[PDB]
């Protein structure tokens, strides 16, 4: 598999409002996780989630953000045997995810921040809606 | 399918991220370890996603009653993954891995000249090398 990964902000999911999103380019499958800060660790724990869900890819493509080009991330991706190169599919995935998140939250009456106790199920439901799990 | 045991243990050499979450597969004795700054429900869930990535999905996970294992957020996560969960005794195999791992961490750090805290930029490769050495004796 060849994946594309990027981070995007979703303030309805605050305080853990940074979403890491990966898309598999051949299948269009999408995995998202939420994070309180954009760090190398956050990217690594997101990829371990995506691997657990979809299988281990041959290569991941990203932009040049510092979470993705750090010595830490470069070391992790070599340890896992995944090649790394430094858009349209991930951007499409972001918009579809944000839309689902907005309509589900506003439907439950949450017009601003979603309470932390409701976030885990609401993000899973948004993700499952865009997939064939 | 697989049955795991998981627990957290503190390792001050790996500070500030000195919380180690450890999972042992009961059939194969394989260990997966990740390190975390705080012991929270999310740290356990990201540890387990890592262990699924390395080992494959288990049928069941056994833990103690620490609050990050029995929280609503952890109960919901385990249910979404379809993993059964069983819970003040402890479990032998994970306590033994905790001991092996701390000994191993000490030996490796000390060979590289780190006598007390390991510099944060060294800790990822060293923890991975310790986990690999125990699995590949
Ligand atoms: Zn970006
Ligand atoms: Zn994490
Ligand atoms: Zn414990």
CSV table of C-alpha atoms and ligand atoms in Angstrom, one decimal:
chain,number,residue,atom,x,y,z
A,1,UNK,CA,0.0,0.0,0.0
A,2,UNK,CA,1.0,3.7,-0.5
A,3,UNK,CA,-0.5,6.0,2.0
A,4,UNK,CA,-0.8,9.8,2.3
A,5,UNK,CA,-0.8,11.2,5.9
A,6,UNK,CA,-1.3,14.8,7.2
A,7,UNK,CA,-2.5,16.7,10.3
A,8,UNK,CA,-5.6,19.0,10.4
A,9,UNK,CA,-7.3,20.9,13.3
A,10,UNK,CA,-10.9,20.1,14.5
A,11,UNK,CA,-11.8,22.5,17.2
A,12,UNK,CA,-15.0,20.6,18.1
A,13,UNK,CA,-12.7,17.8,19.4
A,14,UNK,CA,-10.8,20.1,21.8
A,15,UNK,CA,-8.8,19.8,23.9
A,16,UNK,CA,-7.5,16.9,21.7
A,17,UNK,CA,-8.3,18.8,18.5
A,18,UNK,CA,-5.4,17.8,16.2
A,19,UNK,CA,-6.5,15.0,13.9
A,20,UNK,CA,-3.9,12.9,12.2
A,21,UNK,CA,-5.5,11.4,9.0
A,22,UNK,CA,-4.1,8.7,6.7
A,23,UNK,CA,-5.6,7.7,3.3
A,24,UNK,CA,-4.6,4.5,1.4
A,25,UNK,CA,-4.3,5.8,-2.1
A,26,UNK,CA,-5.3,2.5,-3.9
A,27,UNK,CA,-8.4,1.7,-1.7
A,28,UNK,CA,-9.5,5.2,-0.4
A,29,UNK,CA,-9.7,3.6,3.2
A,30,UNK,CA,-9.2,6.4,5.8
A,31,UNK,CA,-7.9,6.2,9.5
A,32,UNK,CA,-8.1,9.1,11.8
A,33,UNK,CA,-6.8,9.6,15.4
A,34,UNK,CA,-7.0,12.6,17.7
A,35,UNK,CA,-4.1,14.2,19.7
A,36,UNK,CA,-3.6,17.1,22.1
A,37,UNK,CA,-0.3,18.2,20.3
A,38,UNK,CA,1.3,17.7,17.0
A,39,UNK,CA,4.5,15.8,17.9
A,40,UNK,CA,6.7,13.1,16.3
A,41,UNK,CA,5.2,10.8,18.9
A,42,UNK,CA,1.7,11.7,17.9
A,43,UNK,CA,2.5,10.8,14.2
A,44,UNK,CA,4.0,7.5,15.3
A,45,UNK,CA,1.1,6.5,17.5
A,46,UNK,CA,-1.3,7.4,14.7
A,47,UNK,CA,0.7,5.2,12.2
A,48,UNK,CA,0.6,2.3,14.6
A,49,UNK,CA,-3.2,2.7,14.8
A,50,UNK,CA,-3.5,2.9,11.0
A,51,UNK,CA,-1.3,-0.3,10.6
A,52,UNK,CA,-3.4,-2.1,13.2
A,53,UNK,CA,-6.5,-1.2,11.2
A,54,UNK,CA,-5.3,-1.6,7.6
A,55,UNK,CA,-2.0,-3.5,7.5
A,56,UNK,CA,1.5,-2.4,7.1
A,57,UNK,CA,2.0,-0.2,3.9
A,58,UNK,CA,5.1,-0.2,1.6
A,59,UNK,CA,5.5,3.6,1.7
A,60,UNK,CA,3.9,6.8,3.3
A,61,UNK,CA,4.0,10.2,1.6
A,62,UNK,CA,3.7,13.4,3.7
A,63,UNK,CA,4.6,17.1,3.4
A,64,UNK,CA,7.6,18.6,5.0
A,65,UNK,CA,6.1,19.4,8.4
A,66,UNK,CA,8.5,19.0,11.3
A,67,UNK,CA,6.6,16.1,13.0
A,68,UNK,CA,7.2,14.1,9.7
A,69,UNK,CA,10.9,15.0,9.0
A,70,UNK,CA,12.3,14.8,12.5
A,71,UNK,CA,15.2,12.3,13.4
A,72,UNK,CA,12.6,10.6,15.7
A,73,UNK,CA,10.1,9.9,12.8
A,74,UNK,CA,12.8,9.0,10.3
A,75,UNK,CA,14.2,6.4,12.9
A,76,UNK,CA,10.7,5.0,13.6
A,77,UNK,CA,9.7,4.5,9.9
A,78,UNK,CA,13.1,2.8,9.2
A,79,UNK,CA,12.6,0.4,12.2
A,80,UNK,CA,9.2,-0.5,10.9
A,81,UNK,CA,10.5,-1.0,7.3
A,82,UNK,CA,8.2,1.7,5.7
A,83,UNK,CA,9.6,3.9,2.9
A,84,UNK,CA,8.9,7.7,3.2
A,85,UNK,CA,8.7,10.4,0.5
A,86,UNK,CA,8.2,14.2,1.2
A,87,UNK,CA,-2.5,15.9,-1.0
A,88,UNK,CA,-5.8,15.8,-2.9
A,89,UNK,CA,-7.0,12.5,-1.4
A,90,UNK,CA,-6.1,13.5,2.2
A,91,UNK,CA,-7.7,16.9,1.7
A,92,UNK,CA,-10.9,15.3,0.5
A,93,UNK,CA,-10.7,13.0,3.6
A,94,UNK,CA,-10.4,15.9,5.9
A,95,UNK,CA,-13.5,17.7,4.5
A,96,UNK,CA,-15.6,14.5,4.6
A,97,UNK,CA,-14.5,13.8,8.2
A,98,UNK,CA,-15.2,17.3,9.4
A,99,UNK,CA,-18.6,17.3,7.9
A,100,UNK,CA,-19.5,14.1,9.6
A,101,UNK,CA,-18.2,15.3,12.9
A,102,UNK,CA,-20.2,18.6,12.6
A,103,UNK,CA,-23.5,17.0,11.8
A,104,UNK,CA,-23.2,14.3,14.4
A,105,UNK,CA,-22.2,16.7,17.1
A,106,UNK,CA,-24.8,19.4,16.2
A,107,UNK,CA,-27.5,16.7,16.1
A,108,UNK,CA,-26.6,15.7,19.7
A,109,UNK,CA,-27.0,19.3,20.7
A,110,UNK,CA,-23.2,20.1,20.9
A,111,UNK,CA,-22.8,23.4,19.0
A,112,UNK,CA,-19.3,24.2,20.2
A,113,UNK,CA,-17.0,21.8,22.0
A,114,UNK,CA,-18.0,18.1,22.1
A,115,UNK,CA,-17.8,16.8,25.8
A,116,UNK,CA,-14.7,14.7,26.2
A,117,UNK,CA,-16.8,11.7,27.3
A,118,UNK,CA,-18.7,11.7,23.9
A,119,UNK,CA,-15.6,12.2,21.6
A,120,UNK,CA,-14.3,8.6,21.3
A,121,UNK,CA,-17.5,7.2,20.0
A,122,UNK,CA,-18.4,10.1,17.9
A,123,UNK,CA,-15.0,10.1,16.1
A,124,UNK,CA,-15.2,6.3,15.6
A,125,UNK,CA,-18.6,6.7,14.0
A,126,UNK,CA,-17.4,9.4,11.7
A,127,UNK,CA,-14.5,7.3,10.6
A,128,UNK,CA,-16.6,4.1,10.2
A,129,UNK,CA,-19.0,6.1,8.0
A,130,UNK,CA,-16.2,6.7,5.4
A,131,UNK,CA,-15.0,3.1,5.4
A,132,UNK,CA,-16.1,-0.6,4.8
A,133,UNK,CA,-14.9,-2.1,8.1
B,1,UNK,CA,-6.8,-16.7,19.3
B,2,UNK,CA,-4.2,-14.8,21.3
B,3,UNK,CA,-4.5,-14.0,24.9
B,4,UNK,CA,-2.5,-11.0,26.3
B,5,UNK,CA,-1.6,-9.7,29.6
B,6,UNK,CA,-0.8,-5.9,30.0
B,7,UNK,CA,0.4,-3.6,32.8
B,8,UNK,CA,2.3,-0.4,33.3
B,9,UNK,CA,5.6,0.0,35.2
B,10,UNK,CA,7.8,3.0,35.9
B,11,UNK,CA,11.3,3.3,34.6
B,12,UNK,CA,13.2,6.5,35.7
B,13,UNK,CA,16.0,6.0,33.3
B,14,UNK,CA,13.5,6.8,30.5
B,15,UNK,CA,12.2,10.1,32.1
B,16,UNK,CA,10.3,12.3,31.4
B,17,UNK,CA,8.4,9.5,29.5
B,18,UNK,CA,9.1,7.0,32.2
B,19,UNK,CA,5.8,5.1,32.1
B,20,UNK,CA,6.3,1.8,30.2
B,21,UNK,CA,3.2,0.0,29.1
B,22,UNK,CA,4.0,-3.7,28.6
B,23,UNK,CA,2.0,-6.5,26.9
B,24,UNK,CA,3.0,-10.2,26.8
B,25,UNK,CA,1.4,-12.7,24.5
B,26,UNK,CA,0.6,-15.7,26.8
B,27,UNK,CA,1.2,-18.4,24.1
B,28,UNK,CA,4.4,-17.1,22.5
B,29,UNK,CA,5.8,-15.0,25.5
B,30,UNK,CA,6.5,-12.2,22.9
B,31,UNK,CA,6.7,-8.7,24.6
B,32,UNK,CA,5.7,-5.3,23.2
B,33,UNK,CA,6.6,-2.2,25.2
B,34,UNK,CA,5.8,1.5,24.6
B,35,UNK,CA,6.8,4.6,26.6
B,36,UNK,CA,4.5,7.4,27.8
B,37,UNK,CA,4.7,10.6,29.8
B,38,UNK,CA,1.4,9.9,31.8
B,39,UNK,CA,-0.6,6.9,32.7
B,40,UNK,CA,-3.9,7.6,31.0
B,41,UNK,CA,-6.7,5.7,29.2
B,42,UNK,CA,-5.4,7.1,25.9
B,43,UNK,CA,-1.8,5.9,26.6
B,44,UNK,CA,-3.1,2.3,27.2
B,45,UNK,CA,-5.1,2.5,24.0
B,46,UNK,CA,-2.2,3.7,21.9
B,47,UNK,CA,0.0,1.0,23.5
B,48,UNK,CA,-2.5,-1.6,22.5
B,49,UNK,CA,-2.8,-0.3,18.9
B,50,UNK,CA,1.0,-0.6,18.7
B,51,UNK,CA,0.9,-4.2,20.0
B,52,UNK,CA,-1.9,-5.0,17.5
B,53,UNK,CA,0.3,-3.6,14.7
B,54,UNK,CA,3.2,-5.8,15.9
B,55,UNK,CA,1.4,-9.1,17.0
B,56,UNK,CA,-2.1,-9.0,15.3
B,57,UNK,CA,-5.5,-8.6,17.1
B,58,UNK,CA,-6.0,-10.6,20.2
B,59,UNK,CA,-9.1,-12.4,21.4
B,60,UNK,CA,-8.7,-11.2,25.0
B,61,UNK,CA,-6.6,-8.9,27.2
B,62,UNK,CA,-6.1,-9.5,31.0
B,63,UNK,CA,-5.2,-6.5,33.2
B,64,UNK,CA,-5.4,-5.4,36.8
B,65,UNK,CA,-8.0,-2.9,38.1
B,66,UNK,CA,-6.0,0.3,37.6
B,67,UNK,CA,-8.3,3.1,36.6
B,68,UNK,CA,-6.9,3.5,33.1
B,69,UNK,CA,-7.8,-0.1,32.3
B,70,UNK,CA,-11.3,0.0,33.8
B,71,UNK,CA,-12.4,3.5,32.6
B,72,UNK,CA,-15.4,4.1,30.3
B,73,UNK,CA,-13.1,5.3,27.6
B,74,UNK,CA,-11.0,2.0,27.8
B,75,UNK,CA,-14.2,-0.2,28.0
B,76,UNK,CA,-15.6,1.5,24.8
B,77,UNK,CA,-12.3,1.2,22.9
B,78,UNK,CA,-12.0,-2.5,23.7
B,79,UNK,CA,-15.5,-3.1,22.6
B,80,UNK,CA,-15.0,-1.3,19.3
B,81,UNK,CA,-12.0,-3.6,18.6
B,82,UNK,CA,-14.0,-6.7,19.7
B,83,UNK,CA,-11.5,-7.6,22.4
B,84,UNK,CA,-12.7,-9.3,25.6
B,85,UNK,CA,-11.3,-7.9,28.8
B,86,UNK,CA,-10.9,-9.8,32.1
B,87,UNK,CA,-9.8,-8.1,35.4
B,88,UNK,CA,-6.1,-7.3,43.6
B,89,UNK,CA,-3.8,-10.3,42.5
B,90,UNK,CA,-1.3,-9.7,39.7
B,91,UNK,CA,-0.1,-11.7,36.7
B,92,UNK,CA,3.3,-13.6,36.7
B,93,UNK,CA,4.2,-13.3,33.0
B,94,UNK,CA,3.9,-9.5,32.7
B,95,UNK,CA,5.6,-8.9,36.1
B,96,UNK,CA,8.5,-11.1,34.8
B,97,UNK,CA,8.7,-9.1,31.5
B,98,UNK,CA,8.7,-5.9,33.6
B,99,UNK,CA,11.8,-7.2,35.4
B,100,UNK,CA,13.6,-8.4,32.2
B,101,UNK,CA,12.9,-5.2,30.5
B,102,UNK,CA,14.2,-3.0,33.3
B,103,UNK,CA,17.5,-5.1,33.6
B,104,UNK,CA,17.9,-4.9,29.8
B,105,UNK,CA,17.4,-1.1,29.7
B,106,UNK,CA,20.1,-0.6,32.4
B,107,UNK,CA,22.6,-2.9,30.5
B,108,UNK,CA,22.2,-1.1,27.2
B,109,UNK,CA,22.2,2.4,28.6
B,110,UNK,CA,25.3,1.7,30.6
B,111,UNK,CA,27.2,0.3,27.6
B,112,UNK,CA,26.5,3.6,25.8
B,113,UNK,CA,27.8,5.6,28.7
B,114,UNK,CA,24.5,6.8,30.1
B,115,UNK,CA,24.7,6.1,33.8
B,116,UNK,CA,21.6,7.8,35.1
B,117,UNK,CA,18.9,9.4,32.8
B,118,UNK,CA,19.0,8.4,29.1
B,119,UNK,CA,19.0,11.6,26.9
B,120,UNK,CA,15.6,11.9,25.3
B,121,UNK,CA,17.1,11.7,21.7
B,122,UNK,CA,18.6,8.2,22.6
B,123,UNK,CA,15.6,6.6,24.3
B,124,UNK,CA,13.6,5.5,21.3
B,125,UNK,CA,16.4,3.4,19.7
B,126,UNK,CA,17.4,2.0,23.1
B,127,UNK,CA,13.9,0.9,24.2
B,128,UNK,CA,13.4,-0.7,20.8
B,129,UNK,CA,16.8,-2.5,21.1
B,130,UNK,CA,15.8,-3.8,24.6
B,131,UNK,CA,12.5,-5.0,23.5
B,132,UNK,CA,14.1,-6.8,20.3
B,133,UNK,CA,16.9,-8.4,22.5
B,134,UNK,CA,14.3,-10.0,24.9
B,135,UNK,CA,12.2,-11.3,22.0
B,136,UNK,CA,15.2,-12.7,20.0
B,137,UNK,CA,17.2,-14.2,22.7
C,1,LIG,ZN1,0.3,19.2,6.6
C,2,LIG,ZN1,-0.2,8.3,21.9
C,3,LIG,ZN1,-0.6,-2.4,37.2
